[model samples]
Target: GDQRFGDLVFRQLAPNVWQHTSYLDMPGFGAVASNGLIVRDGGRVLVVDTAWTDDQTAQILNWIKQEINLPVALAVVTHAHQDKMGGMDALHAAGIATYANALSNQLAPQEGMVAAQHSLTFAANGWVEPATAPNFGPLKVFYPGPGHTSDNITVGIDGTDIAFGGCLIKDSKAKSLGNLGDADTEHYAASARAFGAAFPKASMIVMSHSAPDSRAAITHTARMADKLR
Candidate 1:
């Protein structure tokens, strides 16, 4: 559906679980695609990832309002990256409960601020001091001890049959072993493998920046991780 000056692309990956892809032509950042998922259970929405900046976040929130008036019950950050969690402070200011791993509680804010500044050079707006949630509800986040950044948290939304792999794993085309500069390559793969093992029944695998995928997709990432030399 088209909204204001932008188009809202909605894909239903499962029963009541919807994915919204925002393609905002960010000036310096080029065409960045921001992914946000809405898991609706009994008319309540739990939003995952808040996209790029405050203005961009408002657009998404407004788009959701058009669909339903219920307040966002919970917000999940797949990782500490700005594109995934930059708008969290805005959601927090609006009274939405936000969640990240205990480690992310410290990591997200620090990285979010630096990312926000980088966005400003392109005249984009962002946030800081994001509201925090005490615990992740109904979701099991597995941290195989750090990769992609010290605070990366791969989430398993159990009942929804979805696993959020974040940057720990990528599509088959990804050219590197891992974002090792910020993480541990070996452990990153281990955490990802363990996540898949824990939920052998997950029908779909959702990535932070790219598309939703399958178990075979993880194999593709593993190959990239091992053969990236």
Candidate 2:
């Protein structure tokens, strides 16, 4: 089930993890929603991505405080987009530790957003398991060679069969590859394939724009990426 708190909504994915959605109103485009994740680990919580704006991000944190009452230990942003790291200032203001891929932090400024204070440098394409340094509960971060954006990454929650693909893995509503401004066109197919392959046990791969579904979303994204070439 999902619970709404003003503009943000939280959908339970597991006992300890919930996927949150926030909206961004654009000119001539209308209000669109972006999805993120919230996970509770012991007395602390971990947030994946953020709301579309600083104010909304603050609201989310407040909701967590009042309802769940868990302090955010760390935040792992999926990319540098407005729907991802746009709330870096809010997280910083809250004094919450944050992290993102090195490339995401590099591109954050260009997108008119703040970057993460810390970053994980990936020398090659692969996954950082739940046992990796600075663990955020059962959550894991993986880079599958860039699809939606060159810096886009996926996060998987170990044992829950839940994965946060951010915008890299398209949902059924996506008719195309979505955005291409910073996309690695030649490698997107491989990226989608790798995204699916990385989460073989994931039944609920959460994406930014749509509801969570089975691996059919993976096939759809992979097929769409193949057509991009």
Candidate 3:
């Protein structure tokens, strides 16, 4: 059987990259579709984020084992939000090594959330941090300051011009910044700009809840943030 979990579907974004979409229902936001990136490199697979629940995440893992024939060695939680790391428990049970920024570790618990078991703290300036290359391959982790949340970070593929912008960047169809309950509106624009500048070669930017597109997502998010300022 091909990979299919309820309404979740894994769509190929590139030869070695796939995008998994799942739906979540919020009080005011209604039913929303969230996205997670799956990067397959040889015998290893890296999951950028997990699905909405442990079961959904399990299905993703099962699919990887059955279809991709590769074990998921590492998973990265881009932020503290539920849509980003809701499946941390499942990941833990599966014995997969997971990681997140220290800020996410602090903030997630406050929201009754749990981040990856292993965490990395931010740099001295509260923004930049040392990048780590996980078992899957040479993936660069970058914290471009605070936009969506203080812990939000981008994961860049080592040799390719692809980056997972998490929720820090918006999709092209986004008219305004999606959520700001925990966002630093004043510093959002600068943070976004820094992200784009850091990855000048990133032609493809993957958002957590929208279509994966070009660098236009960064420009669109920056413009929206500027309007708020």
Candidate 4:
């Protein structure tokens, strides 16, 4: 019964809101169990975050194409991790308008190539950085100011209450905020608070990993971040 959301297997957790999972592996970095979402308003689709690899990203795109002939009107990258932005090249190739926080653009290019190559070595897989479009979508990418990474950004769809929080907030049981190998927990926590303040009315929170959560999840993780601080 829940699978009736136009070929996509979605659960109606709230009115007019549907969520689906993007299950992919990241080997030594732990599994990247992520979620992507779509909201229906006059049958238009707005995608949130790409997947781990080119292939996985293709699958997610194909699912959308199956239901509608229209290309994705907008794609939001939650953060700058390879798994999150690596597949963006594929979306760009399809002529989809991509939007990420301004910080994502700055931080992404710095370590992007290196991270792409390292993923191949560490995950035993090959990767190529996709060409981001010269112009992103219409959404204004606000970097609630560096949480998960120096370039973490959050996206809010114009006519809907949906927001995707890339890697800003991890799953409640995430044990530890991702390794600080390339990030500062202090700034990350600050950014999380900013995102909450920015989108005070978000009806649902879409995460890059795990399933779609509520503002409660963001609140819960922010509390966790405070304790760790």
Candidate 1 lDDT tens digits, 154-229: 6566587787677676765655543366776666665556657756777688876567877766777766655432
Clashes of each: 0, 0, 0, 2
| Decreasing TM-score order of the candidates | 2, 3, 1, 4
**lDDT at residue 140 of model 2 (Cα atoms):** 71
Candidate 3 lDDT tens digits, 121-158: 65654433445333547567778888898778887876
Query: How many clashes show up in model 4?
Result: 2
Show the colliding residue pairs in model 2: none
Candidate 4 lDDT over residue span 1-229, tens digit each: 3553332344554454455555555677665566665544444566666766666667667766665445566666656777677677777767766666444555667756112211100011111122332223323344566566775666554455767676777655566666566666666666777777767777677766546667876777677777656
Worst 10 residues of 1 by lDDT: 118-127
Tens-place lDDT per residue, model 2, 60-148, is 89888986897899999999999988888999999998988888888888889898988876646577533333766677788888788
The runs of at least 3 residues in candidate 3 whose Cα sits more than 4 Å from the true structure, single-residue gaps closed, are 1-4, 124-136
Deviation of model 3 at 45, angstroms: 0.9
In terms of lDDT, the poorest run of 10 residues in model 4 is: 119-128
Worst 10 residues of 3 by lDDT: 125-134
* lDDT against the true structure, each candidate: 0.62, 0.85, 0.81, 0.58
Model 4, residue 156: C-alpha shift (Å): 2.8
What is the TM-score of candidate 1? 0.77
Candidate 4 backbone collisions, by pair: 33-210, 147-188
Model 1: lDDT equals 0.62
